[PDB]
Amino acid sequence: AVFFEPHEENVLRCPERVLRRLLEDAAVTMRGGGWREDVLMDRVRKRYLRQ
């Protein structure tokens, strides 16, 4: 039917730049918290607090 071919020069432009602003605002609220070290660390520390 209707398909373009995979060249090199064909790109994907920015999605009206507000969604990329939303990616940056997702990064700045991702930065505080969510390490995944601290859940393991307080798990093992509460384990050694309970023993």
């Binding site: 209707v2 398909f3 373009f4 995979p6 920015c14 393991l40 660390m41």
Partner: protein, 464 residues
């Protein structure tokens, strides 16, 4: 019985240099499967102190700092640190009894005399016997010392169980021919002990006729030493996850660096009348879901594992030396010998937002297709896997080097690198350095040939 007594006398023999006291252990189906127990080649174990470095390396400092250097030629530090990491572990004795049994019944069938405080009917599916020697530096012993286990199958895989020595010697030190006297005295108690992560428990034995009972060591468990031993264990675990952190901040950097107009580096037919606002929104919703499901078993960890090998660094230098040369001269091509990158094994992170099932470790053989072919990603069987057609996926590609691709559906990709410079080196090795094969029963002498069948000391047959 077979390894416990022998390694007890062997640690009595070798007690003078490294004061290692034996820990006589048995494992079960909670530790590993039956198939994994039938072909377990050999076991490695490591003594690591409360400060958390090692028992093999230097006492003060090491040539294992200067965090990563982000290189390809040395690429960790070279192979001297690999020799160091080989010298950390020790190869302890090992014996498998792959048959269902009751343990106290089995010691009654042998010459051992069993008496516990109360009868604990233990019944497991098989038995594997292992002894470990934790090394007290002085005569005294630190409670916040920790151990390591490594179980090696002949494919090259490994599993790491780690735990403190505090739970091993908690109740024991608080209450506290040679082969003929050892059976007559026998065991005093049986104790199960979980690891530091509570994912696996295992049982230990305690003989009264061991030479551990007459050494008169001293035991202390100071809380600030426990506080730092978990901190050293924090950085040991964190070597896997802050690398995933280093991938994600690289994406957010280059996308702000590019400005949101990312190019294509993968061969996909596309369709212009299809909306792309829906495609960009499913990038953000799925990218965090990859971080929610991050694990050591991932593509970016499998990308590093051939680089932390023995002959990896010199061969990597041989790769650029073959590239960075002159063109072959007209005198060369007529009389020189014939001069030699078709397809490469890539590892892939496939995430899917429609069902939130994310596949972590995927073998991909990818190659340049002709007629300005950007990249095409086939399977091991030429299947041309075709996940990146669908709208429901996003995929991440890594190379055997530190090159990195985050690919949107429709084959549009983000080309960047992998930065590990924030990671130190000694924790980068001990998590996933590629260990070498050591010769055992049924192994060829010369390095690699048509290998015969596995040993497989199993219970389906007789031993013979």
């Amino acid at each position: 019985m077979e390894t416990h007594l022998y390694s007890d006398l062997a640690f009595e023999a070798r007690f003078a240099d490294d004061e290692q006291l034996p820990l006589h252990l048995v494992l079960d189906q909670e530790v590993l499967s039956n198939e994994e127990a039938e072909t377990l080649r050999y076991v490695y174990y490591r003594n690591v102190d409360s400060a958390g470095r090692s028992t093999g390396r230097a006492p003060g400092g090491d040539e294992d700092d200067a965090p990563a250097s982000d290189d390809a030629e040395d690429a960790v530090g070279g192979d001297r640190a690999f020799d160091r990491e080989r010298r950390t572990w020790q190869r302890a004795c090992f014996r498998v009894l792959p048959r269902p049994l009751e343990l106290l019944d089995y010691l009654r069938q042998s010459g051992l005399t069993v008496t516990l405080e109360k009868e604990q009917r233990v019944r497991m599916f098989y038995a594997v016997f292992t002894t470990l020697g934790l090394r007290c530096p002085d005569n005294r012993l630190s409670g916040a010392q920790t151990l390591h286990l490594r179980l090696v199958w002949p494919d090259g895989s490994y599993r790491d169980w780690e735990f403190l020595a505090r739970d091993l010697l908690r109740e024991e030190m608080e209450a506290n021919a040679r082969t003929d006297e050892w059976k007559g005295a026998g065991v005093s108690r049986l104790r199960e002990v979980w690891d530091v992560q509570h994912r696996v428990r295992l049982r230990v034995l305690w003989y009264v006729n061991s030479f551990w009972r007459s050494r008169e060591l001293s035991y202390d468990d100071h809380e600030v030493e426990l506080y730092r031993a978990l901190d050293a264990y924090r950085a040991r675990i964190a070597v896997e996850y802050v690398l995933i952190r280093a991938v994600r901040d690289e994406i957010y950097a280059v996308l702000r660096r590019d400005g949101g107009a990312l190019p294509q580096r993968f061969a996909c037919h596309v369709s212009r009348n299809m909306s792309w606002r829906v495609v960009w929104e499913l990038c953000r919703h799925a990218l965090a879901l990859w971080m929610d499901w991050a694990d050591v078993r991932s593509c970016i960890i499998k990308a590093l594992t051939p680089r932390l090998s023995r002959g990896a660094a010199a061969a990597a230098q041989r790769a650029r030396r073959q590239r960075e040369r002159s063109a072959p001269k007209p005198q060369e091509l007529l009389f020189g010998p014939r001069n030699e990158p078709a397809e490469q094994t890539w590892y892939a992170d496939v995430v899917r937002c429609v069902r939130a099932q994310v596949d972590l470790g995927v073998e991909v053989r990818a190659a340049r297709c002709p007629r300005t072919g950007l990249w095409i990603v086939r399977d091991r069987r030429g299947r041309l896997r075709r996940w990146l057609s669908q709208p429901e996926v996003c995929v991440l590609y890594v190379t055997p080097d530190l090159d990195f691709y985050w690919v949107l559906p429709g084959g549009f990709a983000v080309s960047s690198r992998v930065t590990l410079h924030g990671l130190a080196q000694r924790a980068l090795r001990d998590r996933f350095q590629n260990f070498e094969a050591v010769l055992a029963r049924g192994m060829h002498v010369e390095a690699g040939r048509q290998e015969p069948e596995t040993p497989r000391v199993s219970g389906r047959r007789l031993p013979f």
